[PDB]
Design an enzyme around this catalytic site. Structure first.
Site, PDB file in Angstrom:
ATOM      1  NE  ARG A   1     -19.743  26.426  48.845  1.00  0.00           N
ATOM      2  CZ  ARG A   1     -18.601  27.205  49.680  1.00  0.00           C
ATOM      3  NH1 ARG A   1     -19.223  28.406  50.453  1.00  0.00           N
ATOM      4  NH2 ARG A   1     -17.847  26.430  49.112  1.00  0.00           N
TER       5      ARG A   1
ATOM      6  CB  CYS B   1     -17.544  21.614  46.076  1.00  0.00           C
ATOM      7  SG  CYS B   1     -15.685  21.468  46.800  1.00  0.00           S
TER       8      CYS B   1
HETATM    9  C1  LIG Z   1     -13.716  25.640  39.679  1.00  0.00           C
HETATM   10  C2  LIG Z   1     -14.465  25.578  40.582  1.00  0.00           C
HETATM   11  C3  LIG Z   1     -14.457  26.720  41.654  1.00  0.00           C
HETATM   12  C4  LIG Z   1     -15.146  26.763  42.580  1.00  0.00           C
HETATM   13  N1  LIG Z   1     -15.293  27.544  43.479  1.00  0.00           N
HETATM   14  C5  LIG Z   1     -15.607  28.150  44.814  1.00  0.00           C
HETATM   15  C6  LIG Z   1     -15.756  28.388  46.300  1.00  0.00           C
HETATM   16  O1  LIG Z   1     -14.559  28.224  46.196  1.00  0.00           O
HETATM   17  N2  LIG Z   1     -16.690  28.386  46.076  1.00  0.00           N
HETATM   18  C7  LIG Z   1     -17.552  28.433  46.191  1.00  0.00           C
HETATM   19  O2  LIG Z   1     -18.831  29.618  46.930  1.00  0.00           O
HETATM   20  N3  LIG Z   1     -18.406  28.133  44.986  1.00  0.00           N
HETATM   21  C8  LIG Z   1     -17.051  27.487  44.090  1.00  0.00           C
HETATM   22  N4  LIG Z   1     -17.634  27.307  43.027  1.00  0.00           N
HETATM   23  C9  LIG Z   1     -19.341  27.121  42.487  1.00  0.00           C
HETATM   24  C10 LIG Z   1     -19.739  28.270  41.990  1.00  0.00           C
HETATM   25  O3  LIG Z   1     -18.135  28.628  41.526  1.00  0.00           O
HETATM   26  C11 LIG Z   1     -20.389  29.060  43.117  1.00  0.00           C
HETATM   27  O4  LIG Z   1     -21.896  28.782  43.591  1.00  0.00           O
HETATM   28  C12 LIG Z   1     -20.634  30.349  42.097  1.00  0.00           C
HETATM   29  O5  LIG Z   1     -21.371  31.182  42.364  1.00  0.00           O
HETATM   30  C13 LIG Z   1     -21.698  30.562  40.770  1.00  0.00           C
HETATM   31  O6  LIG Z   1     -22.236  31.781  40.881  1.00  0.00           O
HETATM   32  P1  LIG Z   1     -22.447  31.912  38.447  1.00  0.00           P
HETATM   33  O7  LIG Z   1     -22.131  33.123  38.479  1.00  0.00           O
HETATM   34  O8  LIG Z   1     -21.703  30.805  38.208  1.00  0.00           O
HETATM   35  O9  LIG Z   1     -24.069  30.930  38.916  1.00  0.00           O
HETATM   36  P2  LIG Z   1     -24.641  29.593  37.698  1.00  0.00           P
HETATM   37  O10 LIG Z   1     -23.941  28.392  37.915  1.00  0.00           O
HETATM   38  O11 LIG Z   1     -24.982  30.983  36.741  1.00  0.00           O
HETATM   39  O12 LIG Z   1     -26.354  30.157  39.155  1.00  0.00           O
HETATM   40  C14 LIG Z   1     -26.008  29.598  40.270  1.00  0.00           C
HETATM   41  C15 LIG Z   1     -27.098  30.408  41.112  1.00  0.00           C
HETATM   42  O13 LIG Z   1     -27.310  31.435  40.904  1.00  0.00           O
HETATM   43  C16 LIG Z   1     -28.792  32.107  40.510  1.00  0.00           C
HETATM   44  N5  LIG Z   1     -27.526  33.304  39.153  1.00  0.00           N
HETATM   45  C17 LIG Z   1     -27.054  33.266  38.740  1.00  0.00           C
HETATM   46  N6  LIG Z   1     -26.995  34.861  38.494  1.00  0.00           N
HETATM   47  C18 LIG Z   1     -27.970  35.168  38.798  1.00  0.00           C
HETATM   48  C19 LIG Z   1     -28.482  36.683  39.437  1.00  0.00           C
HETATM   49  N7  LIG Z   1     -27.845  37.943  38.332  1.00  0.00           N
HETATM   50  N8  LIG Z   1     -29.203  37.053  40.174  1.00  0.00           N
HETATM   51  C20 LIG Z   1     -30.098  36.406  41.014  1.00  0.00           C
HETATM   52  N9  LIG Z   1     -29.373  35.076  40.438  1.00  0.00           N
HETATM   53  C21 LIG Z   1     -28.686  34.468  39.575  1.00  0.00           C
HETATM   54  C22 LIG Z   1     -28.944  30.427  39.150  1.00  0.00           C
HETATM   55  O14 LIG Z   1     -30.385  31.507  38.761  1.00  0.00           O
HETATM   56  C23 LIG Z   1     -28.292  29.737  39.787  1.00  0.00           C
HETATM   57  O15 LIG Z   1     -29.231  29.587  41.466  1.00  0.00           O
HETATM   58  C24 LIG Z   1     -16.329  26.748  42.508  1.00  0.00           C
HETATM   59  C25 LIG Z   1     -16.996  26.496  40.819  1.00  0.00           C
HETATM   60  C26 LIG Z   1     -16.298  25.836  39.815  1.00  0.00           C
HETATM   61  C27 LIG Z   1     -16.585  25.405  38.323  1.00  0.00           C
HETATM   62  C1  LIG Z   2     -14.763  24.612  45.301  1.00  0.00           C
HETATM   63  C2  LIG Z   2     -15.642  24.999  46.322  1.00  0.00           C
HETATM   64  O1  LIG Z   2     -15.434  25.244  47.910  1.00  0.00           O
HETATM   65  C3  LIG Z   2     -14.703  24.818  48.243  1.00  0.00           C
HETATM   66  C4  LIG Z   2     -13.333  25.791  48.558  1.00  0.00           C
HETATM   67  O2  LIG Z   2     -12.864  26.366  47.384  1.00  0.00           O
HETATM   68  C5  LIG Z   2     -12.664  25.144  49.600  1.00  0.00           C
HETATM   69  C6  LIG Z   2     -11.323  26.558  49.428  1.00  0.00           C
HETATM   70  O3  LIG Z   2     -12.576  26.970  50.996  1.00  0.00           O
HETATM   71  O4  LIG Z   2     -12.333  24.790  50.940  1.00  0.00           O
HETATM   72  C7  LIG Z   2     -13.988  23.919  50.096  1.00  0.00           C
HETATM   73  O5  LIG Z   2     -13.685  22.463  50.165  1.00  0.00           O
HETATM   74  P1  LIG Z   2     -13.237  21.353  50.950  1.00  0.00           P
HETATM   75  O6  LIG Z   2     -13.654  21.583  52.231  1.00  0.00           O
HETATM   76  O7  LIG Z   2     -13.028  20.015  50.432  1.00  0.00           O
HETATM   77  O8  LIG Z   2     -11.475  21.680  51.441  1.00  0.00           O
HETATM   78  P2  LIG Z   2      -9.460  21.658  50.779  1.00  0.00           P
HETATM   79  O9  LIG Z   2      -9.084  22.567  51.338  1.00  0.00           O
HETATM   80  O10 LIG Z   2      -9.710  21.574  49.098  1.00  0.00           O
HETATM   81  O11 LIG Z   2     -10.065  20.065  50.988  1.00  0.00           O
HETATM   82  C8  LIG Z   2      -9.437  19.891  52.812  1.00  0.00           C
HETATM   83  C9  LIG Z   2      -8.977  19.026  53.297  1.00  0.00           C
HETATM   84  O12 LIG Z   2      -9.031  17.556  52.684  1.00  0.00           O
HETATM   85  C10 LIG Z   2      -8.459  17.201  51.761  1.00  0.00           C
HETATM   86  N1  LIG Z   2      -8.847  16.274  50.264  1.00  0.00           N
HETATM   87  C11 LIG Z   2      -9.335  17.011  49.879  1.00  0.00           C
HETATM   88  C12 LIG Z   2      -9.982  16.306  48.738  1.00  0.00           C
HETATM   89  C13 LIG Z   2      -9.709  14.533  48.936  1.00  0.00           C
HETATM   90  O13 LIG Z   2     -10.299  13.890  48.439  1.00  0.00           O
HETATM   91  N2  LIG Z   2      -8.763  14.181  49.987  1.00  0.00           N
HETATM   92  C14 LIG Z   2      -8.395  14.732  50.813  1.00  0.00           C
HETATM   93  O14 LIG Z   2      -7.810  14.377  51.260  1.00  0.00           O
HETATM   94  C15 LIG Z   2      -7.219  17.888  51.683  1.00  0.00           C
HETATM   95  O15 LIG Z   2      -6.409  18.058  51.243  1.00  0.00           O
HETATM   96  C16 LIG Z   2      -7.652  19.519  52.871  1.00  0.00           C
HETATM   97  O16 LIG Z   2      -7.100  18.685  53.733  1.00  0.00           O
HETATM   98  C17 LIG Z   2     -15.313  24.454  49.798  1.00  0.00           C
HETATM   99  N3  LIG Z   2     -16.496  23.588  49.116  1.00  0.00           N
HETATM  100  C18 LIG Z   2     -17.282  23.439  50.656  1.00  0.00           C
HETATM  101  C19 LIG Z   2     -18.117  23.174  49.872  1.00  0.00           C
HETATM  102  O17 LIG Z   2     -17.467  24.583  50.976  1.00  0.00           O
HETATM  103  C20 LIG Z   2     -17.074  24.558  45.922  1.00  0.00           C
HETATM  104  O18 LIG Z   2     -17.811  25.636  46.827  1.00  0.00           O
HETATM  105  O19 LIG Z   2     -17.194  24.336  44.554  1.00  0.00           O
END
Ligand SMILES: Cc1cc2nc3c(=O)[nH]c(=O)nc-3n(C[C@H](O)[C@H](O)[C@H](O)COP(=O)(O)OP(=O)(O)OC[C@H]3O[C@@H](n4cnc5c(N)ncnc54)[C@H](O)[C@@H]3O)c2cc1C
Ligand SMILES: C=C(O[C@H]1[C@H](O)[C@@H](CO)O[C@H](OP(=O)(O)OP(=O)(O)OC[C@H]2O[C@@H](n3ccc(=O)[nH]c3=O)[C@H](O)[C@@H]2O)[C@@H]1NC(C)=O)C(=O)O
Length: 266
Positions: free
Chosen positions: A150, A197
């Site tokens: 991250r 998250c």
């Molecule tokens: C439903 C949902 C699911 C998600 N699942 C995941 C996941 O599985 N794994 C995960 O890692 N994250 C996940 N995220 C979090 C998020 O999508 C990531 O952190 C993503 O990389 C943010 O990108 P963004 O374009 O929305 O950045 P923003 O939220 O707009 O900005 C985040 C940061 O990046 C900077 N930034 C944006 N654009 C630029 C640029 N062009 N140059 C330099 N800095 C920039 C901003 O200034 C800020 O510091 C999820 C979010 C949601 C809502």
């Molecule tokens: C969504 C984000 O990233 C997500 C990413 O999409 C998924 C898939 O790899 O794994 C991370 O979640 P996570 O560790 O909660 O993974 P999950 O697979 O959702 O959950 C792990 C385990 O916890 C259990 N589960 C999850 C939520 C909950 O409330 N209770 C629970 O029991 C699930 O059933 C699963 O067996 C990332 N978060 C981080 C900090 O690494 C995000 O960063 O915004």
């Protein structure tokens, strides 16, 4: 002659909270040079941002125009949506983005946050990154950008403007099968107003699972709620204030030593 207007950032974040800001929509290299002449922040898809109710005083830069153009086999503008590229790569029979399915990022935001899942992270999918800083554009390899969980270490003030992706030819049906596994793995997650998250996972663990075990799912402050579906998702039920979201975050932190994954503005 770029568009500059005052907006409410609640309209520009996936969580749907945030006060006023001056939004600069940059379409060209020269427009970027102009917009960055005073203190600025960069806004991607706003999917990792908790913007407070007072908003921010700096210029907020969004990358559009030339920064939204892409070629999978060439340069990809940082304003391009990662979900689009994930599907385009599958359509082109190009493998390497499957592990990024479900991340609603712009390319630039995905680079800044090294967005990823257990299947892959943005750093893995990069060949080169153009970064604008100190008034000039420079090209970096990913190994120069201090990637971690991250995390990145971009040059100070750095704006990611374009990338080259690391992709490999694969049968389309195989790419889609890999994507189906990512979809299956994400099944427990809500798709409502959220910023994904809220908390980073402690190394051994899932913050979501820890929140779940402590019984905190369902706790509410105004229209902010810890999701019933996944404990690490704080959701906006309609008109949450950032104040309410912060209060809920503090409630969790009273019970569990967790750190935010969200970036807070200001
Ligand atoms: C439903 C949902 C699911 C998600 N699942 C995941 C996941 O599985 N794994 C995960 O890692 N994250 C996940 N995220 C979090 C998020 O999508 C990531 O952190 C993503 O990389 C943010 O990108 P963004 O374009 O929305 O950045 P923003 O939220 O707009 O900005 C985040 C940061 O990046 C900077 N930034 C944006 N654009 C630029 C640029 N062009 N140059 C330099 N800095 C920039 C901003 O200034 C800020 O510091 C999820 C979010 C949601 C809502
Ligand atoms: C969504 C984000 O990233 C997500 C990413 O999409 C998924 C898939 O790899 O794994 C991370 O979640 P996570 O560790 O909660 O993974 P999950 O697979 O959702 O959950 C792990 C385990 O916890 C259990 N589960 C999850 C939520 C909950 O409330 N209770 C629970 O029991 C699930 O059933 C699963 O067996 C990332 N978060 C981080 C900090 O690494 C995000 O960063 O915004």
């Amino acid at each position: 002659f770029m568009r500059v207007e005052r907006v409410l950032l609640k309209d520009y974040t996936t969580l749907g909270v945030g006060g006023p800001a001056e939004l600069w929509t940059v379409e060209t290299r020269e427009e970027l040079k102009r917009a960055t002449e005073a203190p600025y922040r960069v806004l991607g898809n706003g999917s990792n941002l908790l913007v407070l109710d007072e908003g921010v005083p700096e210029r907020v830069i969004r990358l559009a125009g030339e920064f939204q153009t892409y070629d999978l086999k060439g340069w990809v503008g940082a304003g391009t949506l990662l979900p689009l590229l994930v599907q385009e790569a599958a359509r082109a029979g190009l493998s390497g983005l499957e592990g990024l399915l479900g991340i609603p990022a712009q390319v630039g935001g995905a680079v800044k946050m090294n967005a990823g899942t257990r299947f892959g992270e943005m750093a893995d999918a990069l060949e080169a990154v153009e970064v604008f800083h100190d008034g000039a554009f420079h090209v970096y390899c990913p190994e120069e950008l201090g990637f971690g969980y991250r995390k990145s270490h971009l040059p100070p003030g750095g704006i990611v403007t374009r990338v080259r992706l690391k992709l490999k030819e694969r049968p389309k049906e195989e790419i889609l099968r890999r994507m189906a596994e990512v979809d299956r793995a994400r099944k427990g997650q809500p798709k409502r107003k959220s910023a994904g998250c809220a908390f980073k996972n402690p190394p051994g663990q899932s913050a979501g699972r820890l929140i779940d075990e402590r019984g905190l799912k369902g706790l509410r402050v105004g229209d902010a709620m810890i999701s019933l579906e996944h404990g690490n998702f704080i959701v906006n039920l309609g008109q949450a204030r950032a104040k309410d979201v912060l209060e809920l975050v503090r409630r969790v932190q009273e019970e569990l030593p967790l750190e935010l994954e969200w970036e807070v503005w200001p």
